[PDB]
Amino acid sequence: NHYEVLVLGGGSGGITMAARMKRKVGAENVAIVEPSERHFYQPIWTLVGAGAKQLSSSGRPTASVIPSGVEWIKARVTELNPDKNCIHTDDDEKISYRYLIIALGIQLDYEKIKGLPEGFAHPKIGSNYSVKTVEKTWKALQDFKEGNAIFTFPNTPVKCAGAPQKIMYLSEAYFRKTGKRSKANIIFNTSLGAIFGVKKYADALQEIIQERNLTVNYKKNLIEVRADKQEAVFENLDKPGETQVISYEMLHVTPPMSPPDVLKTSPVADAAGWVDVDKETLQHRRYPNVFGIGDCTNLPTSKTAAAVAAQSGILDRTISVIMKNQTPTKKYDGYTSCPLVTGYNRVILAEFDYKAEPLETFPFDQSKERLSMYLMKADLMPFLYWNMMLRGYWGGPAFLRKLF
């Protein structure tokens, strides 16, 4: 079998590109290889675990988001042979392509922590990063009575770097408005030395932490979970060899993450396993008919759906000129955004580019907690996601930004 355009991955980047590609080469010349039955708008999972949104609202059947006419090949990619323009699937089938677009996302690795994912079968522990553990966050919050509440951040790349602390501010506000704050010691144990990588939003988060009696312990990485005993083990990344066992009344886990297994050894990967693409055009550095988008690439900016949206716009142009034997000229800037939920009524909308410097859209100031930015995150963006991005029409708010 053969397709002018073969898309690996039916998540955010995959559907968006197949939508856009259908209009360029025809729906009958595009195929998507995606194994899962459901497609998830993962960003709302932060609010699900805080008890603010229902989980079933976050997903729809994968057949709903397939652009009509585009082939859904429900399989797992198990091998890439770009030298001979094909891939293999766990159906023992070989698929050739004229062009290839890789959008396989990022892989969660709960089992590299001793005791996970088995311990998740016990109470008081949860994780907003997986459809099987996001509601367990919310139950741990309701079931909280007295003690330590621990929020973690791993020593790997992650998607939505702001999410692990978003649920901490949500959990804090929950304990206050429910009469349990006095009984909570609230701890952010993070592998990093900084609360956030862009200083003007870091400063604003530092302010909140200082006023709400939250503790941040830097260079602490979760390595072991003893669910039965309600204990967690951290290693001190500043003192190799040193560890600390902490008891918890509630534990929220951000798991270690890595590029998908089939990409780790693939020829399309760099040394570290991410898809090796041009940092501006998103074309593969060694295979001119391969392209990458989203979490699975080595694009040196934060891994978010916003970035996918802005990346799709650029890639649409790059593949088009390539198909026409022209040199690309439109360049990606590293745009990305984190809507930092600081409470049930407020969001700090951080936006920046490759320069790790702010690049805000709205003329007011997004360093300050805002109801409008909360309502945008909670209500508008899911709507634009299902009805505009996955239909290949949203490509970054730079065209909206330059209006004002």
Added chain:
Amino acid sequence: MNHYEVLVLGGGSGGITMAARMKRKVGAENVAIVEPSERHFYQPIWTLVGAGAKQLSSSGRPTASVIPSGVEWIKARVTELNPDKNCIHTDDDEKISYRYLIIALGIQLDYEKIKGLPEGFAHPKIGSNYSVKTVEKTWKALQDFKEGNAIFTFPNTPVKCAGAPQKIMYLSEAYFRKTGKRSKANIIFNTSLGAIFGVKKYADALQEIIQERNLTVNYKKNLIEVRADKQEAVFENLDKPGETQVISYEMLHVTPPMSPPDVLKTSPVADAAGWVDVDKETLQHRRYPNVFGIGDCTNLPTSKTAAAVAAQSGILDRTISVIMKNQTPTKKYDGYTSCPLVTGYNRVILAEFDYKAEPLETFPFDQSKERLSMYLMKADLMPFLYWNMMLRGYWGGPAFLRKLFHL
């Protein structure tokens, strides 16, 4: 299924050392080494091979000649590991089970991640001291050098012997002066890193030499493409994502990107990043109590060197004995490592440190200074002790000699 009490994956520096030590503990018949290569190499001397000072063929011996006598040698490649079922697969289509497992699969070279490589090595003026196929091409390119750029790279990955990408730079610079062509060479070190070295005492000494010898170091520069035909090289700027620089060379020494061995990258015994996940004090595995790891393939947060393998092998010996007696380990690895920075054909800055990244020097004098003594020890004493003492299980680092210097 075939079975052995102690199974060693990899017959390089750490694997041969642990097998000799284990033979004396459980008997040679209960030890097996899985290693596919016919030849065992003392890679440290390759630095002096690329500089024209030592013969490549003396850096190697047949693997059969270093296999501790009586130990089984399984000439094959490990293709999968299954710690849950105490077994591994080989490219023979054979499984092998174990009571204890020592992982020593080193680190892996990824020349093909640079566009143009390794095809470009067919051309002159380009070499790499990190591969037996390319270490002599460094020397030849250095002999062929007439005029222009001599470029030396450092990748955006973990490496082994972090010092070697610049040892060859100093050796080449000396050679240029030795042969009267220093005037005609512009000498560039393009590093992905932000600093010349990670311990300040020795960084300062290296900076003094960069200044006195007029070397240019461009930080956050990563080699991404070689065009051997046109003798150009393409570097990416890690501070400004997206921009690149094309620059011609008259000599290019490539330090390749490096990574865990493919077989480990997806394995249950690796951490999320692919390195063997071990306890940083005892070298015991964090999740499987009967797996241990040594050397370049581990997540031990210190320099990847054979000196480290030596110091870890003494710890691991004590760790495994205590484990076989069902006790708790108490001897702790401190992260000892050492990098003999060859700064010229007769001087060496013997850098030694530990997990704190602070100096832990063995000799009573100051190893921050270039020394002839330390060069001779690197070039002549160390290979002899390697072939005759480390590979026989009788070298585990020099901390006894350091404590001995206590009056």
